[PDB]
């Protein structure tokens, strides 16, 4: 008998189940009747601690925003297990008493899919020792797929490891979103062990539904129908949840689209400092988004936080150049996409020379790196379009990059 399980089941099954004993009211009455029997009730959600010291368990069906079925978590419970915003909580609950408006948490069974006692003893995210990415996250399916081309080129141009802090940088309509979707598919197939989250900020609503029905993971969104205030709050919840999972030695990946628009939202809510950078960006506005992107890191103790976010350039607005260059000096991987290549309908429209990854020797074998190095020396003299036409025709001849390398010989 769980609250979110009742919220998921269709109304028809709920009405039948309640007769055996608005939809929100069906669930409420069913839960109360089960409480009358003396049987236990259960609920769950991600914790959000308010300023007063108490918190609520937000639900995914409300994008982790305030919801009618939110579960109150008392301050004493938060202090007992050192809970912090982002902690996924599951436990026994009770309907609200007279003069109350919320379900209350009686006992916490699970904190971050683990024993509550262990959440008292753990090393905090702020204290984890950072590292450059060690373990390679290979995107190439190898299934000889035509979509796989995007993954294969990615592996050659800008490898991705666990804890990477990368950017898919390109002008509007260059292929950033679909490239992020290609990455999401590659992650679900090649790395089902990783905890995949897709954060969509200030982007098209149809892409939200396209992404949640396409990726095998969790999708949190805040479309351009929403104000900047909402974008910020939602992103903060998601990033804190990632940090908690990393404290449990998990390999989390966040595909963010778009991080440029998230930075704009921060610039919208930031207190005016009396100093404004070129493009209309407050001098203090990029500190918060910089810490958000900089969350991504490799941990020596165990686990990692990867963030692959899309960024905008050549928008005519200098603000986006500032944001992009600031994030480049924060991260360590950029896959550039060219409008010139995309207008010729050449996909993936990847600017090979501008793309790249820092310390890529930590993510590649000795000979793989030597082969990529040659390949770059060969592609550099070519034009943006010529480079991709050349590379895609050569890769299309084989199923995998390994066979392509063997052809180079």
């Amino acid at each position: 008998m769980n609250l979110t399980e009742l919220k998921n089941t269709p109304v028809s099954e709920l009405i039948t189940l309640g007769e055996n004993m608005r939809k929100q009211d069906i669930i409420f009455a069913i839960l109360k009747q089960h409480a009358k029997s003396g049987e236990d009730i259960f609920g769950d959600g991600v914790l959000e601690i308010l300023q007063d010291g108490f918190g609520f368990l937000r639900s995914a069906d409300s994008s982790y925003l305030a919801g009618p079925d939110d579960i109150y978590v008392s301050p004493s419970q938060i202090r007992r297990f050192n809970l912090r915003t982002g902690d996924t909580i599951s436990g026994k609950i009770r309907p609200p008493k007279e003069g109350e408006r919320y379900f209350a948490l009686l006992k916490v069974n699970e904190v971050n899919f683990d024993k509550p006692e262990n959440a008292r003893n753990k090393i905090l995210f702020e204290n984890l020792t950072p590292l450059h990415a060690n373990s390679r996250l290979r995107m190439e399916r190898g299934n000889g797929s035509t979509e796989d081309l995007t993954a294969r080129v990615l592996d050659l141009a800008s490898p991705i490891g666990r804890g990477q802090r990368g950017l898919i940088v390109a002008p509007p309509k260059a292929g950033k979103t679909m490239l992020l979707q290609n990455i999401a598919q590659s992650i679900a197939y090649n790395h089902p062990d990783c905890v995949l989250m897709v954060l969509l900020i200030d982007e098209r609503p149809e892409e939200v539904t396209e992404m949640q029905r396409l990726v095998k993971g969790e999708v949190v969104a805040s479309t351009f129908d929403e104000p900047a205030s909402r974008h910020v709050q939602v992103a903060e919840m998601v990033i804190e949840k990632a940090k908690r999972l990393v404290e449990h030695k998990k390999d989390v990946i966040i595909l963010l689209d778009s991080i440029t628009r998230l930075a704009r939202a921060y610039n919208t809510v930031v207190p005016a400092s009396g100093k404004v950078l070129t493009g209309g960006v407050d001098a203090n506005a990029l500190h918060r988004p910089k810490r958000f992107f900089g969350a991504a890191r490799n941990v020596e103790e165990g686990g990692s936080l990867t963030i692959i976010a899309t960024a905008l350039i050549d928008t005519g607005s200098k603000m986006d150049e500032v944001i992009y260059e600031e994030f480049k000096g924060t991260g360590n991987m950029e896959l550039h996409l060219s409008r010139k290549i995309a207008e010729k309908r050449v996909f993936p429209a990847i600017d090979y020379n501008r793309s790249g990854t820092r310390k890529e020797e930590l993510l590649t074998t000795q000979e793989e790196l030597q082969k990529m190095w040659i390949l770059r020396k060969i592609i550099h003299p070519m034009g943006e379009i010529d480079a991709m036409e050349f590379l895609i025709n050569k890769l299309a001849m084989t199923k995998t990059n390994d066979d392509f390398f063997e052809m180079m010989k």
Binding site: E367, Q370, W373, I374, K377, I378, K394, M408, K409
Partner: protein
């Protein structure tokens, strides 16, 4: 014929034209490069 085991041209074969002037058949363009005697091995 000559084999290259050092640098980018490692794991490749070729022929010495005349330091050793050895070209490597890479992709679809010959790359003539000069390697030391130890940088390459006889075929």
């Amino acid at each position: 014929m000559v084999r290259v085991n050092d640098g980018p041209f490692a794991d490749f074969n070729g022929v010495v034209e005349e330091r050793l002037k050895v070209s490597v058949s890479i992709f679809g363009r010959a790359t003539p490069v000069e390697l030391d005697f130890s940088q390459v091995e006889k075929a």
